[PDB]
Design a protein around this ligand. Structure first.
Ligand SMILES: *[C@@H](C)[C@H]1/C(=C/c2[nH]c(/C=C3N=C(/C=C4\NC(=O)C(CC)=C4C)C(C)=C\3CCC(=O)O)c(CCC(=O)O)c2C)NC(=O)[C@@H]1C
Ligand SMILES: *[C@H](C)[C@H]1/C(=C/C2=NC(=C\c3[nH]c(C[C@H]4NC(=O)C(C=C)=C4C)c(C)c3CCC(=O)O)/C(CCC(=O)O)=C2C)NC(=O)[C@@H]1C
Ligand SMILES: *[C@H](C)[C@H]1/C(=C/c2[nH]c(/C=C3N=C(/C=C4\NC(=O)C(CC)=C4C)C(C)=C\3CCC(=O)O)c(CCC(=O)O)c2C)NC(=O)[C@@H]1C
Lengths: 172, 162
């Protein structure tokens, strides 16, 4: 996989070029936003169980057929596999945030996930609902004004949002 | 490609867990060092042509036979001199890439892997490149931690050739 710095380097190498000053400036700015990026990852990680559990609870009350006998989340084995899927997506989303690039998601999420689910009979559209619930809670927690130096993280929040959206698109 | 950030991710992912404070501190470490790395990368890039030409000349001066002996492996022909300066430029470019990502990944992947086989196959002497690298180290004009960053990667290449 690649992070935002490596992505620029690989592109330049293919052309046999040294990076330009504007490319260097762009990388300096990403370094400046560094502390903010770490706060987001730390906040999401520190509240991971809550984010997953509440999203799961909300999904199951909205779609009760998922847990009735014969439903895809019925039996503890399937429920645990379901909770694990949500934790995995959240984990990969946090990796994408620290890397500043979606590639980390691609080489996994693109491991035919929508094909895998179809073959197993996992309702991809329901997983997408779970990801959307995780997205809203993760952004609220990460963007909480309390107990942090106040400043603007709007650019980061949009970036975070795009990673959840990318995951939700891939599962269906 | 390997970078301090992708390695931190790889470590977490290998253990099936979220990133821990150990990995966040490692990324913080790369961010703090980046100011010196990027100053070095900017300086080396703007002075590239001068360092490459001067480095090639330092090799020819130290090893006179390289510009006199006939043969494709030598810089005794126009094509030879052009390939020599090209090679030196590749090493300088890889150094700037390492400075940018904060690790040896670009050099490891694009240059070091296969280095021994190429040098033996085409009859290129490792010591020719060590002299070119020593020239760059002595002439980049950097100071402080930026000189430290540049030299650490230059030395990493020297060690691979020794
Ligand atoms: C948007 C995400 C919100 C926000 C962020 C914000 N954070 C800072 C400042 C700091 N954040 C850190 C935190 C870390 N540095 C680390 O090394 C690690 C990993 C080990 C973490 C978790 C640090 C040290 C700073 C600087 C010191 C400080 O406490 O201020 C800022 C200020 C800008 C800056 O880079 O200093 C901001 C804006 N602030 C918000 O209002 C958002 C909710
Ligand atoms: C919860 C919101 C879901 C639900 C989930 C189920 N997933 C099951 C199996 C399973 N899940 C994946 C997920 C996956 N996404 C990735 O990114 C990665 C890799 C990091 C993986 C592995 C896979 C590959 C599989 C395959 C089998 C397995 O590993 O368990 C699953 C179990 C199916 C079964 O064994 O019968 C379920 C129940 N199901 C629900 O109803 C909701 C919507
Ligand atoms: C210069 C210090 C001296 C020297 C150079 C010389 N090199 C070659 C040819 C090769 N050099 C490379 C090196 C690279 N190719 C890569 O892709 C990379 C990483 C990005 C590197 C470092 C390779 C693979 C070759 C062989 C293929 C090619 O021709 O490009 C030559 C010619 C050898 C030949 O047999 O034709 C020369 C002249 N020679 C000197 O005498 C200097 C001291």
């Amino acid at each position: 996989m690649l992070d935002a710095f490596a992505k620029v380097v690989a592109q330049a190498d293919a052309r046999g070029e040294f990076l330009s000053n504007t490319q260097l400036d762009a990388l300096s700015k990403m370094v400046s936003e560094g502390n903010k990026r770490l706060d987001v990852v730390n906040r999401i990680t520190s509240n991971a169980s809550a984010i997953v559990t509440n999203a799961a609870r909300a999904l199951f009350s909205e779609q009760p057929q998922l847990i009735q006998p014969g439903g895809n989340a019925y039996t503890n084995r399937r429920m645990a596999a379901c909770l694990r899927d949500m934790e995995i997506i959240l984990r990969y989303v946090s990796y994408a945030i620290i890397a500043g690039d979606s590639s980390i998601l691609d080489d996994r999420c693109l491991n035919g996930l929508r094909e895998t689910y179809q073959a197993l009979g996992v309702p991809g559209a329901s997983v997408a609902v779970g990801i959307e619930k995780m997205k809203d809670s993760a952004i609220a927690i990460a963007n909480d004004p309390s107990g942090i130096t106040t400043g603007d993280c709007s650019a980061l929040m949009a970036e975070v949002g795009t990673y959840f959206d990318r995951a939700a698109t891939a599962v269906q | 490609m390997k970078t301090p950030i992708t390695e931190a991710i790889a470590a977490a992912d290998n253990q099936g867990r979220f990133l821990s404070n150990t990995e966040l501190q490692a990324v913080n470490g790369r961010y703090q060092r980046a100011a010196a790395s990027l100053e070095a990368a900017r300086s080396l890039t703007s002075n590239a042509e001068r360092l490459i030409n001067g480095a090639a000349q330092a090799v020819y001066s130290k090893f006179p036979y390289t510009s006199q002996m006939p043969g494709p492996q030598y810089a005794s022909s126009a094509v030879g001199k052009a390939k020599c300066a090209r090679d030196i430029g590749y090493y300088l470019r890889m150094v700037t890439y390492c400075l940018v990502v904060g690790g040896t990944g670009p050099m490891d992947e694009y240059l070091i892997a296969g280095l021994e086989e190429i040098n033996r196959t085409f009859d290129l002497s490792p010591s020719w490149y060590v002299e070119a690298l020593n020239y760059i180290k002595a002439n980049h004009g950097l100071s402080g931690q930026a000189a430290n960053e540049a030299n650490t990667y230059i030395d990493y290449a020297i060690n691979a050739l020794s």
